[model samples]
Target chain A: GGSDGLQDVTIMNQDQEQIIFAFPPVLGYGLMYQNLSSRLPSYKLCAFDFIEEEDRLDRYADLIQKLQPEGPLTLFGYSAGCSLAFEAAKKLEGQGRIVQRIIMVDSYKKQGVSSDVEALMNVNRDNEALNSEAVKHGLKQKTHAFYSYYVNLISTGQVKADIDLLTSGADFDIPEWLASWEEATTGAYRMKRGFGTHAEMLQGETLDRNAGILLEFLNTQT
Target chain B: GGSDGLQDVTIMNQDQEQIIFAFPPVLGYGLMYQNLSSRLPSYKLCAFDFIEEEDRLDRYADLIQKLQPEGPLTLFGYSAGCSLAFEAAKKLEGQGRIVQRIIMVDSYKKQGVSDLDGRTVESDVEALMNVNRDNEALNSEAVKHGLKQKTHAFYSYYVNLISTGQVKADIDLLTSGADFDIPEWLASWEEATTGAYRMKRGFGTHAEMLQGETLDRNAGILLEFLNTQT
Candidate 1:
């Protein structure tokens, strides 16, 4: 409950100039991205503290701006956090901050109330250890914030930063997901496919495939 | 090219007080409802022809109103036609008509142009038939053209009118065994209805649900929903 200079957890502490700042997923803390950090050896990986706190898009954007202050930024988020990353990019762009890229891994925002309820049930089912009332309450709060953010985004216009959308191959190949992102981005938007389902995407061989896509995309110019 | 009193085709011409107005699926004509009409014997079934025409929601609404004038309306549609049915219902309800229910069979509106163009009825129908090439349905150039036009119209409606407002009629969404995001799709429909909402899954995949045993079960579910007296 204390922010003793622990706002961003360093996953890959390196001397690389380009650091990949990731927002925590809906299910877990910033360390959830630790699985993919090793696959990305050349680049720096830093996970922003998102758990056990209010879902303030403005605050998250401010934290990123405060950390780098003046460097070209790359933002990453998985699942519901993709919207977080997206919102933050918009904010940074508002202040004329240069946001180079935004990587959305299997991004899903709110559809309606029942899906959120269903999402909570799935969350509880997948993580039995996280079934405690306190954790559940916090998750519900974060989920509601994520839902509200999407409603706002529907009215919000395009962003200048280019987007790299990583989709899980196991899902239904929903076109609306990519369509929404395409409509919101004025820069280059490309959708890449990962090798696993939504849950298993960030680990094992699937993570290897996802990491390769990111690395190649980052290494290329224009 | 002739309207020769062929705007609507009767599937089950019964004298029953209840008439279920069905819109055609993307792959076939309004006669696609023919398979389900036998299953729903008690209620009269009339399918609105949707091929070789522009996708006009208001026109479709006018046609339904022109045929029935004023009565308790129950709208039904399959696949892409579900959006057509949905838009028509809103238009009908706009004139203060009471839409009792809306039945959507494996309802899928346009998600994006890529998916619509890539997985058009040609590929979907082939997938539904599991690659056993029955080319008569596939060979017709008119059928192919109509499918392309319908797909475009659906994409246009979703981009333009899906967010107009909520409908007054209870929605009954019947899905197949396809593996998609059920909750998300349900949530989208849930947002559009102020009335009751329910989704039931039938056996078999996508278009297959309209045939044999799956159709019987789905028809049963449809009957159960309609007779609930809500």
Candidate 2:
């Protein structure tokens, strides 16, 4: 089979010195991180689109390497994508690459996803008409497969990346999921509270504060 | 890790020449097929116990190979076990072994399961709790948790695992009005199997087809299928 040659969605900044490769919490909607990307104007952002080929992190690492020839990697994962970032970081680091930091926004360790992602699945399930559209329906299958693959991986594996976990102020966060990450992280790890609820933390005024925190981590020497 | 060495539940027949390795329609209830085993008196029947180690089909294949040293394998899968048997048979066949036939009893391809009366895995576990309260094995928390985890693992990966795969061995699919859309499910089995495929329907409900008069009737049909030259 021939490769489709689909490139990831990249928001280029003037300075190509530092690039933050972002994985979407939900597959197929890479543009959701536009607000977050806009907030962090100094660094170049590349949000990954739907990975239709394989659900393995090696494929993500291969794409990451192909996009940037040679550079230290900084990963930004939001919601369920934290697990993706964690595994991708592990894969990259295993191949003798340096992963500077991993920024997880309102992270979910396993199947305990945020309400917004859950609502997307529920909407797809309840609305019978949506099943007819091939692209949307295919995305649902791939998304489920991706999550199942990572949930199994994240439950079993650990990573050495210094993690900056950003949690929403809402009471909906799962402590067990956080503990799972805490157990997975080998080096420096810190948890900080963002301004809004799970989904809201990425948008509006909340992004300003969360973006500042992201910069604080980015600016830090450790 | 050391092997647990938990042997499968076997109903020994006088003649050990022919063995029917049965995968339970539901895991953790191997003895549920006792009545069906009783009807088939000629062949040695070994119903697989709950596989706790790994959820891969190769594990079942390894267990099957361990149990039966050398012979043409005959597999019997009830309900959801049909998929398990199908996948295991595929693996065994891939390793240059002969799979005589696969007997699927009221098979379900994906997550649409019967006898539980629930849609989600959580709800199915709840329904099992409510319906099988008298059964001690189904009443335990560990068993329920195991069932939930296995169910999630199976349903989530089955579609992705065998998306474009086909089985070469002959398949005998037995269906009752137990599952959703009998024709569609049959078509799925038919599409997956390249060898001779047959479906026998108009049996009882999911649970009823495994007991009493219905099981006897189904066993007779199964015997006929076994006896007939392929």
Candidate 3:
């Protein structure tokens, strides 16, 4: 909705502190940060809608360049967006953009995201319950195509992009959560526990508190 | 959207003897039905999109009448839409509508939805909403709703709060859930129907059945169930 070749979901932009760019607001650490976005006045905030142009991470890579950020770039993502964010970071890194930090929240990748991708493309619960058909077809089409790309598409570029997983405080019970992201990048996959789960990582007061923890983690970098 | 206040969701309306009408297709059922609609059919088929209305059931009931259906009204509902379709049948019953059979797929009781889910119904609803809303705003947000739809429960604010007594109509219970026993899911529906409460396997996951290519298979099984009663 803005002239920056990106949709302005909400921008608390400033020319000062390091810029924190995040995408796929809902599951990929997007909407969950709505509350925290207000609290973090020190850092320039930009939450871009990434679903509209999910063809490749290069779109985001190119879009981030449009911001023409002055400080080091830190990217945030959750679920599928995590890996996608990782890929985007690599793209920016390739373009000689200053990528200072990368944080992924409870994301997983499959060599081939074929069959398993169907469930992930769900529309809103209200829409699903009320039978809002307008979004489902579009949603399904996007889900299959979008995730298939995420699965089949691999960009393990030399960007040893330091990877830190923002995990829920509950349990690392899931085997995939233990170490799967390790294979994605040479950067040691470190775990950062928060008050959520593989499923319930964001929203509620925990998301705000988690954001504080996330900021604390983010502050430890460039 | 057609001029008849209905967007044509049905494909083979081949002037058949019966009509199988479905309610709001957003639930994976919508896609599943779309795949099924074009398949085998001696009867005309169509789907109704509930959209965002204040009184969704009232709107659906109104549309049912607008069809001025001559044959028995066969209805299909998935997840939250299941109870909605059931309630709609009751509403149509009062209007002397001929609702012959009701098919409920992977439907859960609103009362027990969250308990079975281990999260608040509102959380499930919002999780699902956030998924659809978030695609990172449609770009990176692409497959996220698909992610949220799998993670969140669509039933919460809209599920029936008060208990409705058993009705004379039979229920075709189609269930796929990991957290509960199949019989338990069926009994949840049997409590609502005095007639034959049957349970059948459709797809593996509750969400998976009506999703992607699985919807086509679900349609075949469902179409068999629907055609037999007709």
Candidate 4:
């Protein structure tokens, strides 16, 4: 045996392990993955963080090279990680590597100057003051009531489970991008701040519809 | 006992003798009131059905003439009925009548081009065909699996509910709208089809988000603003 230094290969089924290859700033990845996995029980979730001070693409490439390919893989990426996944997929295709399936969750397909993005960033910057204002007004109670109503719908089967999946969770952090408003302030603040706040990102049944489409795509592919 | 006479009276909250007003040809009122009552259980649900042939505005005016000043009255309207309600409210306000509250749900603010309306109508049309297409492409077993997979999503939730005979008894009627495939069919057909499928009149959550500002105005946000100003 030549001293090429071969690492131990770990093999796990979809039920045993769900590998999530996440881009830089693992906090967002962890939060989103945890939330998504709560509803989807078919896979055991694990995230691989690619930490690069500079040149994130190279770091992601290295991580992919190290992964032990066993059974069908369910790869999920978000935002920058989504872009990284696309680049990595191109490289893998060139090397004739196999990827069981790929999922790009809430990815920006095309970069553009969006007013919605600008509005969200502004809200995050001043969330504390806004939260205080929301408390001052009676908006906090209304927000809670709204959230409770939607949550009740899911629990009672009046609204579908996927709707619940899409609606729940506000904590998402992406460095260089705006922090999710849900995480920045309490639910009270979110409601008072109103539509423009998280309108940049997905919300409510809209998220449910989009997620349903993406999940369906993932399920259909070989 | 007098012929062709109206009487005004006040009644306490008598839970046992609850009346439900059922409006024919327009079902969104029923849906919204049901949703509201589901959340707030203290109030009794009463429905009044307007005859199909009469103009909705005329019917609303007639309702106001008949129902008069009795106990706290909560008038609910959705879609086309909202316009009628607005006109009725205007008449009542002109006559200096007192109504406890008016709740207009998913009101169509204006008669103009709407992307949300277009998308929803398109989705409804696609849904009618998509179900059939999915079945043909996949075997019975595969279709069953597909149905199981999507049961939790909104689109799938409605589709499955309708298919299983849980909601909307005439689910198959949608097939007729799907069969007519032309721009002309889409234009005229959408109007008639949408009118026929009364429940679809209310703006869906997705559409509402897009048209929130407009809908808020139609739902008396502007009226409330005016009231605050005065």
Each model's DockQ?
0.01, 0.01, 0.01, 0.01
Chain B vs. true chain B: TM-score per candidate: 0.77, 0.78, 0.69, 0.36
A-chain TM-score, model 2: 0.78
* Residue pairs with clashing backbones, model 1: none
lDDT of 3 by residue, B63-83 (tens): 777665565678877766676
Per-residue error for B96 in candidate 3, Å, reads 1.4
Instruction: Show model 2 residue runs off by greater than 4 Å.
Output: A1-222, B1-3, B7-15, B111-119, B135-163, B177-187
Q: DockQ score of candidate 3?
A: 0.01
TM-score (chain B) for model 4? 0.36
Residue A129 in model 3: shift from native, Å? 58
lDDT of each: 0.65, 0.65, 0.56, 0.33
Worst 10 residues of 4 chain A by lDDT: A155-164
Docking class of 1: incorrect
The deviation in Å at residue B128 for candidate 4 is 30
Candidate 3 chain A: minimum summed lDDT over ten consecutive residues — where? A112-121
CA lDDT of A121 in candidate 2?
55
| Candidate 3 stretches greater than 4 Å from native | A1-222, B1-4, B7-17, B25-32, B51-54, B116-123, B126-154, B177-179, B182-187
**How do the predictions measure up, each by TM-score?**
0.44, 0.44, 0.40, 0.28
Candidate 4: where are CA atoms >4 Å away?
Answer: A1-20, A24-32, A70-73, A110-215, B1-230
Looking at model 4, the pairs that clash are A18-A44, B19-B46, B20-B46, B20-B47, B21-B46, B21-B47, B21-B48, B22-B47, B22-B48
Write one digit per residue (lDDT tens) for candidate 2, span B102-142.
98877655423233333665665455445445554444575
